[model samples]
Every structure is written in structure tokens, then in C-alpha cells.
Target: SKSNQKIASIEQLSNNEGIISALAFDQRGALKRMMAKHQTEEPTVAQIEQLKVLVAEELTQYASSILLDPEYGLPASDARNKDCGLLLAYEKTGYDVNAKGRLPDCLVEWSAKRLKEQGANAVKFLLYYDVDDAEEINIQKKAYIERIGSECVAEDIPFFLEVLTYDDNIPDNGSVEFAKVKPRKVNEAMKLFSEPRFNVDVLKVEVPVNMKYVEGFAEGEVVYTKEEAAQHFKDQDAATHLPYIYLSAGVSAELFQETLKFAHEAGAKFNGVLCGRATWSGAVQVYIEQGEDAAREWLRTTGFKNIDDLNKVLKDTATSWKQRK
Candidate 1:
């Protein structure tokens, strides 16, 4: 039965071989590395390409059927601790092309067309950059998005861009530095939303949580006491309008609730709150281990039945704030 299941999965993608081939050309090495890392066997390029062909064939068969399946739509959960590294490795190995790079218009079109043939109505493109380097890259990014957006929209293929920003610092151990976003930079970062290439309806922005802040409560009642710090959001014209904000830092249930409250009261500019560590990544399992009522309690404390309710509550609170003396 397990073998049969694997065979069925293989057959699903096999029908759309062309799309798989194109993807392989752009991400073979990355895929190879991922397979090697996961399977713990160093694979030759030829072996990796062979596997890619098999996968492409399988995906082609069932791409459309799966798209039509209600339970099998796009994945919305975090892939960071899961498949992100493998994806990055693929990109690094030149098997994958950065959407912002010199990828030809025709290639992007073909890629989309192929996916559609396989029954995938949506496609995700990943983008990464250093925070300190954003100033230099933002303009180029804007241009790239405009071109890709024009092409993808014409074909009715929604483009989902995954953006991540990190600092360029080096730790004492010489590990690649993970930079935190000061409020000001976070504001500047929001400009990506205004790019003509972006379709707000189709776009989803992923915001990383500050681990230190998430794990520990701010030292006082106010998190950003400094005038400059408090003004970061105001300056960038961003904090007020994000569709979703993620609370990634390890936050106590109490502080997480407060953060949601503050954001909600801030304005109607954003739509939802997506939290991970606060909800997972800890000793307390709210849904599975803790039960539905306990999970509901944690969510209520954070301000809603779910993210949708949280957005509504935020808008109501923002309106109330405006009328305050």
C-alpha cells in the first residue's frame, strides 16, 4: 500500500514533463543538494537530473486534479525550518533563478504555462536580500516585479513572492549574521508593496519575528521607548498598513496578547496576525496537546476567534482610538 501510494504520487506529476524539465534546468543543483542532504547520499548531477525527470512526470499527471481538490490548495504554513534551506540551496546551485535576475520573459512565461498545464493555478517565487543592502536593491526589485507581474497577470498565473531581509553582521564565530529590522528599516521595507508589479490581492508578505523580543517581554510597559524607535513606523508609513504581521519572537502568552492588542488598536491598515513560536515552538501545545478550548483561550487572549476575527477587532479598536481625546 505504501508503495502504491508512492506510485500514485509519482504518476500525478509525470503528466506535465515539460514544466518539470524547465524547473529542473533552473534548480537541478539545488534539488540535488537537497536530496543528498535529506537522503544523506551525495548525488551526481546526472542522478539528480534523472530524479527530476521522474518527479516532473509524476507532478504533470495530477497537478490539475490536485488544484481542484479543496484540501490540496497552496501551502500557507512556514517552510523555513522545513524545506526553505533546500530551496535556497537549489537557488544557489544555479538550478534556480532569482526572479529579479536576468531570467528571460519567455522563460517566465513558459514556466507559468507549464505549471498551468499541470493544473497549478498559483506559483510562488522566492526573493532574499540583506537589510543593509536593501537601499541598493529595492529599485531593481521594483523594476523586476513590474515586468514579471505584467507577464504573469496576462496569463492569469498569480505570482507569490517570498521576501526575507537579514542583517550583514558577522558573529564572533564568523557565522553569517542574522540582522534584526529596526522599526525604520521595517518601514522602508514596506515600499515593496507599492511596486506596480505587486497585485495586493495575490500577494502575501512574510515578516520575521525578532527572536529575542519574542522570547522575552520588553523591559517595560512600552517596547520602543526611544523617540526614534517609536517613530520608525510613522516615518516609513508602513507599520500602519501591513496586511499581516507575524509575532515570531518567543513571547509569553500575556505579551503576545498585548502585542496583538497594540497592533489592532494602531489602525485598520493591516489585515491579520500570523504567529508561530507564540502559538507553537514551545512547551505548550495549544491545539493538540492542550485541547481546543485551551487553544481558543490563548487565541482569545491574543484578541480573536482566529486571524480573521483579529483583523476585525483591530479595525474596530483603531476606530475607537481615533475618537479618543
Candidate 2:
């Protein structure tokens, strides 16, 4: 619908914070999981190039913006093609992953102007910070947050920070000890990153709601009832005041939808979301198991329909982190 491209301005929007619609941003995993299943060391760049374009084109008209990965994979292909907003993932991962995550070099080496030139309106960075990490790691993480924010300001683009918390010091990441700290870790992590110097526009964060139900809700299960879910807002009272939205942590769409209902209806300044696997993982599976045509068909029918549903669910209850507050 190039001839029918929707046109509007920031003033024309009804909501204060627009939805950050996403098609999960992953490179190593996507390549390894999808194409490298045939006993290959890594997926060749050949099919990945086409796959990126396919995902980008499929989501163009459906979203207000697309967040594709640059450090891990080829987002420029997607960014180059999208008429909607393109927010590039600008941080490199797998650098320091013992008990912490790091964004090495960041925009210092990658020109912000180049990202802007490639049609990116904003840049997103996922930073890992643990209160227990060495002072140097803590300081550097904060510095990345502030410096990236500064760089974006100079380049005149917004910065979205997704704060990831981990306790590598713990003995039980996959056990009860971990869940006991998940909620507090997330809430406190936000607090640490909210220093005024960072100048972050929006915080893409974990459900500040009680995640005690995280285990039972692993796949397609509903862990929070309206009663428990409503309690989420009470729990959410402590999260950052920064304009915020939820990031789908590889959950199922049904679960994601339920969480959004709680998030929006729960009375937080919750904006929208950046959902990937929860929305399109099935299409990706079809892409791998079947063929390109089948995957495209799935993306067209099922994936497209799922996004429509997510958007509807988000808007129907979406309130705060927008004009209301």
C-alpha cells in the first residue's frame, strides 16, 4: 500500500506514549535456532539477509515503528525498508556475561549520524547491572547509560533503555533463590538507572508486578487472576516514573496479552510493549520447519493477526505513561 501509506503527525495521535511495536530483536539465537539446526556451525549470511527483509516488510504497515538488531544481526536491511519508525539496537552483547552484561564501545564507535542516516529515529540499549557487581562494573554501566543518553541528545534521537538484572553471585539462577529476588532486583535496578543524568526518554522494563507466579506461567498458562493481577499495580507503584512499557521476555502471546491487561488496567503509567517471540515465534518455526513460502504465509495470516490482537489489547486498556499522567 505504498500509494495508501498512512500519514500523520505527533500532534495527531490520541495517546501520549505510542506503542513500541516489536518483532523480537535477536541475531545469534534467531540464526542458530532457525537455520543452523541442520548441524551447521552457524547460519550462512545468505538466507539471513532475505529473512531480515521478510520480517521487516511484514511488519512495516502494522507497526508505528520497528526495532531491529544491528549489533547481533542485520537491522539496517529492515531499517532501510521501513516507512514507519525504525529504532536500531545499537549495543553489542556477549562481551561480559559472567554475572553482568556489558555494552562495549556503544555509540562512541558507531556513529549516531550513520544510524540516523539509515532511517533510525531512536536507539535502544539493554544494560545489565547488579548491585553486587564490582564498583567498576557498576560505574561503567551507569556511564554507558548517561553517555548513550548524551550521544542521542547530540544526534537528536530518543534513547530507550531496557535494564536487565542478574545475580551471578547466587547459586540458584534456575531455582527458588532466583525467583525470590526477581521482583526486588527489577524494581531496584530501575531505581539505580533512573539518575537524572541519564536522560532516558522511556524505560522498557520487566513487569514490576509480583513475579512469584513466573514458574507456572512458563508457556501458555495464566498465572495471575484479576485479583492477583490487580495486585500488580500495587506492586508496580514502586517502579520508575519514567514513561515505561513492558518487554516480552520470550513469553507466549496469551501470557503477554494477559500481562498487558494487568499492566494497563493495574494503574501504572504503563505505555505499550515490545513483543517478539510471544508474537512471531510460531512464524519463525514455520519458517524453519517448512519453507519460505509457508513462513511468509504464516507471518501474513497468523503473525499479522496476532499483532492486530496485541495492539487492540494494548490500546483498549492503555492509559498511563501517556497523556493521563
Candidate 3:
């Protein structure tokens, strides 16, 4: 049965302990943009693909799974450690820049069945969600997710839904004003997506509060006191019945580790993480400056340390997804 198959696939995507300490290398245009910053010429697709393969080869040996994409990540998939599970991204990179609502669209040529055939243990879709958006826009997002969820169920692959909250009104996503409202947006979105209609297995989520605005982590005025910030983690945990994992969300590796510690101390029962940039963002400059060999060395040393440290933190802090069920 698909239900039983789905459970096995989910199990495969995690460690023996069922903690999903996965490496995320699914960035498409975003990777190219990062590389663009260092060179006068835009980065070549070949360079992007090469970097992903290096990351998979050096890093996936330590991760429970590797989250990649159907685009550039297919080659990287072949380079992954045999022990690591594979999750493939289904969304096209980014949404229409001129659009309102930061809408989502899937890759037109791909479906869950095709992704599974391509060797995906699971299917991951990233959604830019704003709980406050007009019903017309929000419902479209909802319907899109429903169909994807239905397709995954039919294909018998686990669906990993990644919801990134954004607000059109907020000019700066990192500002204190946005931080003040982040908890509510994250919690409500989690609550909404937890509905069985989505057929979502694991939610790849952001930390409910921006650590920069939390009292202890903040350099200046804080939107949330340490005590207050901890409550948001608990609230987010309470908002969903489905198992959920954290996304690095582009924070520094050291900072992401601290955030996980804070969440655990707050008594949140998060399953684990699908960390991306935090693990390897530092190597981009190395790859750009010295070349692939330098990047490989950096990934071997610093990148390895980043994931190793994260796994140590996870061993201490994360709950098994099975417990969430």
C-alpha cells in the first residue's frame, strides 16, 4: 500500500534513530547568484553543478540524507554517499519577480512519479506563504499544495513541504518589525498545513523567531526577551501535529547551531534539520577564489566541522519524527 511505502521512504530519509540531519544542495539560481558576487562574469551552470557534486561527495558521508533538485542536482545525486537518502526538489527556482504574494510554481515537466524514477526517496516543495495574504492568493497556494500532496500520495513517496513566510508590506525581511510578527505567521502557517488534506509527511520549517532579535542574541533592542523567544518555539511545536524539521534559512552555521540549542532549551520537540547554506555557504568564496580543489578542502575541513557539530547538537536536542506521529 502507498501508506506503508510512504512510511518506509520517510524512514530511509533519516538515520537509524529517525533524525533527519540532511544536507540541502538544491539551490538553483540562488547558487549562481552567490557565485556571481565574486566574479565579473555570471557563474556557469557547469561550475554550479561541479560545486554540488563536490559537496555531495565530501559531505553526504556524514548526513542522513541529501536534498537536491531535478535541475542541477541530478549529477550530484550520483556522487552522494551510498548511506545517504535522496530528496528531490519539485518547484522551479524562485517565483516571478513582478508577482505579488511571492507565488509558487512547480516544474512543469516533472511530477512525483518522475521524481521517484529519478531516484528520490521523497519529494520536497518550497512554498512562500503569507498567512495575511488575500484569500484569493492564499487559496491558490492552498490548492496548489493540495494537488502536489495528492500526487505524492498516489506515487507513494513522502512529501516534504517547506513553507517560507514572507510579507509584501515589509520592505526588509530582517527588520525588527518583521521579527515581531514572525512567530504568528510561522505558527499559523504550520497550523494550516498540518491538515491531512496536504498529505505532507515532514514540514521543513524556519525557526519561529529571528535569533538576531531575541534578547540574548541581539546586539541592541530586542523584539523578544529570552523568555519570550523560547515561548514562540513551544508555540510553533504545539501548532502542528505532523513531524517537522528545521531549515538553515541562510544563517551562519554557528548561529544556526545556537538557534537549535535555544529551541531545544525552550522545550520544543523538533525532529531535525534540512540545513543548506549554513553548512556550505562559506565554501562559495573558496571555490570562486582558488577553484574547485580549494572548495573541496574547505568542505572537507570547515564544512565537515559544521555538519559534525550540528549532528552533535541534534543528538542532544532533536526528537524522533516517529514520536511526533
Candidate 4:
């Protein structure tokens, strides 16, 4: 949940008062930043290679954790080569009842075998699912969670679940549309939490706030008001039922504080907010500026004197921001 605690860009970190507990850096950014610094006229492929090494090394030195998406896994010859505070093995799961939810047995076996072969037990699986069918999705999720728990019981390979609810309006097949959660849907989602088989310590629920179709809902208008949204989950039945709730959306500095305030009051169990565009939409400088600002604001709103005081901060920042404006 450290990843979702503050939503901001790399550029924002430099000036923002909030400390970054975790970072997700793109390989492309690393390569581009290195290339930008080198004024080369000749074949600098060797230099580029060296630069990649240096960049990776520097990143590991600063970031408490790093998440490598699927692309880097192929070239990551040795897990240690890319190891930071945490190494993530994220695999895409299409929203189909037929597809297996956990990593395919072959994949789990392969990852375990590879990690052992490398002489370290420092890797973990971060499972991502693109589920479309609500009723059947829980079954698939349970299977995966059970499998992971079974595998990790002895090996100690922790697992993280990233669950998403699709928004159907975007034209791009890959684009996700945001849909407001009805009370029934919310209640049903909660029921899934009671199943011991699928009890993951961490659960990331993605809500699309940027899709054009969801703008009204995201902005505190339409069917769900910010207060109603927050109130829905404020009761003990909803809070104690889930270990954590990650507010995933395309957020901005403008709405960052407001969203967190609403989510916390609405009965969301945690203060983590995972956002992408809000952290990396513009040029590097702009992105960092906005990202840092957002992070600082989040830190303040979350009641943390410092980034490390997440627990204490949560106590003070648990109230809603509805009365502020």
C-alpha cells in the first residue's frame, strides 16, 4: 500500500515535502534520461549499456522498492540483477472464467525454480486480473489465492492481488471505463472478502476516474455524491471486513486530497491511493512538480508528520475532507 499512499510523478519528488516510500520507474525513462545526459556523436551503444547499469544501480540505492512490469522480466536474466526492496512478478489475467486465476502452475513452478536456481528467495508474485464477469471472477480469484498461499507457505514467496473493475466507454480496447459501484455490488464485493481461500493481505481495487464516461461520478456529481460515496463504507461492517482498499484511479493534484478524504470517510479501510496519470501525464519537469505537490498534500491529509509514520498518520487523517470546501 506504500505505492498508493502518495500519488505523484518523479519530478514531483524533488520539490514535494513528502518522501517517496516506493517508486515504479519505466525502463524507457531510464534509457531516455541517460541518453539525454550524454552528448554523443558516434556509436555509443556500449556507453548506453553502461549507462543502463548505472541507472539501475542508482535506482536501487534510493528506492525502497521497485516494481518491474512484464516487459523487464524477459531480460532480467538474474532476479538479483533487478532486485531492489521488492521484486514483482506481475502477470496479466484476462477476465474469463476459464482462464486460471493464479499464475499458471507452470509459471509458478518456473519462477520458483528460477529463484532457487539463482540462490535467493527474495522474489514475489503480484497478480493482476482483467476480470469482466463479476460472479465468476471471485471463483477464479479464490483459486489463485489458494494456490499462492499453498506455494508460499513453505517457500515464503508473498503475493499481492491487483483487482480491477472495468469501465466500458473508452474506444481503445485496452482503455478501462470507470463505473460507479452500486451498494449491492459493494456488498457482494465485501462478501468475497470473508472467504478464507481468497483472503489476500493486500487488495487493490481499481476505479477509473479519468474515463470520459465516469467524469461525473469521479468529480462528485451524478449518481454518487462525494459524501454518499464516503458514507457507504464508514460503518464497522464495511471497515473491519477488508484488510485494505486501494483507491485506484486517474487522479490529479486538484482532486487528490478530496478523493482520499472521501474514500477514507466512506469506510475505505486504508489511506492508500494508487494513481498513474496524476503522477506522469506531462513533461518530466511538470510531472515531477505536480507529483511532488500531490504527494505533499497527501502526506498532510493523511496526518503523517513524515512518510514513515503511516500508522500514526492514519489515525489523525482518517476523517473526511467534505467540510473543507
Candidate 5:
């Protein structure tokens, strides 16, 4: 028994009821972190890297699986940090979320082999796809996903396929139109990428509807027509046949909670959320401005309470990634 330990794997974790510590990231640092860590737009690479290690170290206290950038070259090597997983952002830069790239000069085999060598249990690839996307973009996107997926299989590590939607020519049709179409778009994306060839064991997807729908519903204010309700109910409820989880994307905590309750009640089988920003933005601001103790204090009191609240909201319906079969 002394030698026996159940190492956490992404496939195994997705089956369990647990939240992911998801912050191997880009933009928030460029914008919010820039202002917080310094007072301007350009932060030294060293400063950002230190910021990552500290934030991740703080999060290791909780999250079921921590997502780190193998490329970022940070810490998580403590015996206590074994739950850490690596994120390979297929995108071009930390700033450009929309600009995704290939496995880099066809390094799929090497990357896959090195995943374990790097001591990460899972690899996450952030790729772009929408129900209606640019034709060239869509073809290239799937190929990128498949390349990563099959490689993950060859290496026998679980990889998350996080799909974000976009349209080349559509104007910002505002939130109501967004509410109307997002559920449909999410359903389509979920189905399209669920193919075995893509090697997506865990799907990190967006919420199926507009934020307002969930928020208003939570407040007992109804919106939308009967047909909208029916189809939204039809597709949104069953968007992912596979085990899935929601991403925060910088939404407010209240909105996130409302979604938790909404999705659970709507018969979603999500394990838990892989979130950032909303959970720790306040803590981060304090960490940079005030100091570590204040930030850690914020996490202890405010941040963790946020986590606990989300867990309770979805606990009844969630099947922890640990138990996902």
C-alpha cells in the first residue's frame, strides 16, 4: 500500500466529478495581467513566466488536473504537483486566439513521445471551429485536431480538444441573435469533432446558449419565443453525447453559476468546469498590487468559496472525470 498510488490521468480525471485548474494561458496576461503586474502593455517575459508559476503553485492546492504550458517552462514538479497536465496551444501566439497552427513541421510523433517524457498526464490543444467557418480554416482545423488526437493515442495520453467558433463575414449580431444560434453552433461543433479519428477524449466546450438566457432564467425572467425554446431545448440539452465540461471565457461568477444550475437541470453530463479569470482575477489583481499574502488570502476565502459553490451547483448530475467510463 505504501507504494501504491493512483496517478491522475486526463481520461481518468474527466470521468470524475472535479474541477480543472486551467490557466496555462495568454490574453488575460496581455491585458489584465499587464496592468496588474506592471502598469502598461509590455511586460518582460521573465515577469510573465514568474506570474504563471506562482499562480499555478497557488492553484495546485485544489484543482483536479492543472493545465500548464509545456512551452511556458514553469514549475509544478513538486511531488505534490503530480496532477499537473500540459497545454499545447496550437494557436500562433498567446495574443491571437483565432490564429491556430499545425503540430509544427510535422512533429506529431516527437511531440506525442515527449508528452510523457515531459511528465504531463494530459495534453490540451486549443483549435478554432464553428458551425459556419471559413472553408480553408475548417479543413485545416480538423487536420490539426486529428494530428494531435492520433498522436495522443500513440503516446497513450488523454488530450482535450477545445473548439471555439467564428464566422468570417457575419457582423456582431449582438447577444439575442447569439443566444439564438450559439446552442446550434455548439451542438454542431460537438458532433463534428467527436469522431474517433480526432482523438478527443475530453471535450472542453463553450456554453450552448447566450449568457443572458441563463442569467434571466435564473432571475425568473423569461425570454425568447416558443420555437426558440423548443429547438434550444432540443439541441442544447443533448449537445454532447461524450463526457464534456464548460469553459469560463472570462464570464462573471454569477453567470457561471447560473449556467451550472441551468446545464445540470437541462440534463448535461459535464464532469466539471476548466475555468480561469473569473475564479482568480480578483486574487491576481491583489497578488500583483498588494502582495502574495493578500492574494493567497483572497484565494483562501473568496476564490475557494467560488470553487465550492460551483461544485455544489453541479454535484448532483456530474460524473467526475475520475469515474468517466
Candidate 6:
């Protein structure tokens, strides 16, 4: 019965049809980077909080839940739709670039218990994992996940582990070189985390194929044909029986939609999306160039439409987490 609370929270985080259409705003460093692109100086904490609150106020109405951070996201939590479930991030911002394994650490001030008290229905922890990394580092990463898993279990909250695969050998993850091995990186990671030791209720993952390298979506180089890309998608779905959702990974709204369509055509059984930038990145520029009013207006119009369109896609292609066997 201890686990039932986690189950109920998962249910609360999904729509009536059981698809999780969550907005991911747990971004700290990346959000800062996005804001810095427009302004000469660093964005103030006030600015970030205001932007997040605007997004939460305007867009969470359409989303089932929002993945936010305790740092700046607590303010947005109050601004979010009253019914929207909250998933607080326990991990710190970006990992140290100078660190050996892209190591992860929890926010010293927070834990699953504290997050639960803060109204978190679930906990999200993002890890940068590479299956090819040294056995020593990988084992440590595994241990890190195990500790978080145990904490979530004790707190009786669902754990959403978001893994971003990176290659130590190939520094550029966006290049065609990394895309070639993307499937293995994603699939193997999924299989490893699904071992029950991690206690991951839902895996937040990337689209198995980088759309920029897929046949129809290719911009410059074609690493894989559409058929080959489809196979990768299908294989990723088969890697773990646990429920998983796709993250937008900073792609444009249109490209994210196309990726979802392609995943459906490939027969992948993704549960839904924890879409972030795809639906709201455009407003960053709006907020920078204009004022909050313009930003709010853009969100009300474009941002709301983005979520609505994504909902249309999930309705057609996403399977319920309950359907996974």
C-alpha cells in the first residue's frame, strides 16, 4: 500500500486518456543560456522567476503537470493551474563540464521528503549517462540512481528519471557521429535503469533518432534512411517494458511534432511527452525583445496552441503507461 500513493500521483499526472502531457521547466542552466542569447548580460533571478511564472500561468492550464525546480520553480508552482501536478527536480543544474564523467549530485537542501512537502507529486532526476563510460564511473552513476530510488520509495512518490546520453569519445552529441550510436546509448541505458533497482516509475527519454539526421528531416547529412530510423525507434521501445515518455530535447515545435509522427509510424509505444522548449522557446525571444505583456501575449497565442497541437499528436500515437507489459 505504500506504493499506492505513487500510483495515484502518476494517475494525477496524466490526462483522462492516461497520456502524460507534461511541460518540463526544470531547466536551470539551459534556460539561462536561452535568455543570455538575447541579452548581453546574465539574466537576473527575478527575470527567470517571472518568465517561469508566466509560462506556468498561461500554459499549465493545458498540461497535465509541470516538471519544475525548487530553486526558481516554487514561485511558478503557485502560479500554475491548480489541478496541474507538480514534479520537483532533486538534482542540481548542469553537471560540471570539467568533471570526469559528467557526474551528478543532488541539491543539498532538498530530498524527496522535502519535495513532497513542497507539493511535489513526483521527483525528477536528470542524469548524463554513457554506456561506454569506464566501469568505475558507470557503477558510481548506478549507485547514485539507487539512492534516489530508495528515497522516492521511502517518500512514496513516483520517480521520473530523465537520462541524457552523451559520448566521452565523441564530444559533439549533435553531430552525425553521435547520432549513429544514439540508439544503442538510449536503449542500453533504458535496459539498465529498468532493472527495478533504480525504482524508476517513468523514464523521460530522447527520441531514438536525431530528426536532423533522419531521411525526411535531414538538414545536411543523412545518417539513416527513414526505414532504418523507424527500426531504431521500435527497438528502443522494446528495450524496457517500463513506461517511458519522450523529451523535446530543444527541437522546434514543428520538428518535435514531426518526430512524434515518425515515432508513431515506426511503431514506438511512447507513453507521452515532457515537452519543454518546443512549446515555449519562442517566447524567450519575445520576452527579451519586448516586455512581459508581449511575452504573455505570445504564450497565450502561440504557446497555448503548441500544447494543443501536441495533445492532438499524443491522442493519436501515444499508448497509456498502463498498457506497457
State the lDDT of candidate 1 residue by residue for 1-325, as single tens digits.
Answer: 1134223332332222211100111233333444454455565544433333332223222221111111111121111112111110101223123343322122322354454444443444434444456444555655655665565565555443434443434322112123234443344455655444464222223332332233233442333333333243244334333233333234444454555454443332333332323332221233335544554455444322333332334344322111211
Residue-wise lDDT of candidate 4 within 88-138, one digit each (tens)? 443432233454432232233355335434432223343433334454654
Using TM-score as the yardstick, the better of models 2 and 4 is 2
Look at candidate 2 and tell me the lDDT of residue 47: 62
lDDT of each: 0.34, 0.62, 0.92, 0.37, 0.59, 0.92
User: Which sections of candidate 2 miss by over 4 Å?
Assistant: 1-17, 29-41, 71-83, 96-109, 171-174, 209-233
Which residue pairs clash within candidate 2? 24-276, 269-321
Q: Which stretches of candidate 1 lie over 4 Å from their true place?
A: 1-124, 134-148, 157-160, 170-181, 198-216, 219-223, 226-230, 236-256, 274-277, 280-325
Over 128-170, each residue of candidate 2 has an lDDT whose tens digit, in order, gives 6676778877777777678788877677666778876667767
**Could you give candidate 6's per-residue lDDT for residues 1-325 as a string of tens digits?**
2277888999989988889989999889999999888999988889899999999999998999999999999999989898799999999999888879988799999988999999999999999999999999999999999999999999899999999999989999999999999999999999999898889999999888788988878879999999999999999989988889999999889889989988988989899999999999999999999999999999999998999999998899888878946
lDDT of 3 by residue, 1-325 (tens): 2388888998888988888989999998888888888998977778888889999999999999999988888899999999999999999998787877777798989999999999899999999999999999999999999999999988989999999998988857799899999999999999999899998999999999989988878988789999999999999999998889999989999999999999999988999999999999999999999988999999999999999999999999998888934
Deviation from native of the Cα of residue 111 in model 5, angstroms: 2.0
TM-score of each: 0.43, 0.81, 0.98, 0.51, 0.78, 0.98
TM-score of 4: 0.51
Worst 10-residue lDDT window for candidate 6 reads 1-10
Candidate 3 vs. truth: CA RMSD?
Answer: 1.2
lDDT of 2 at 71: 48
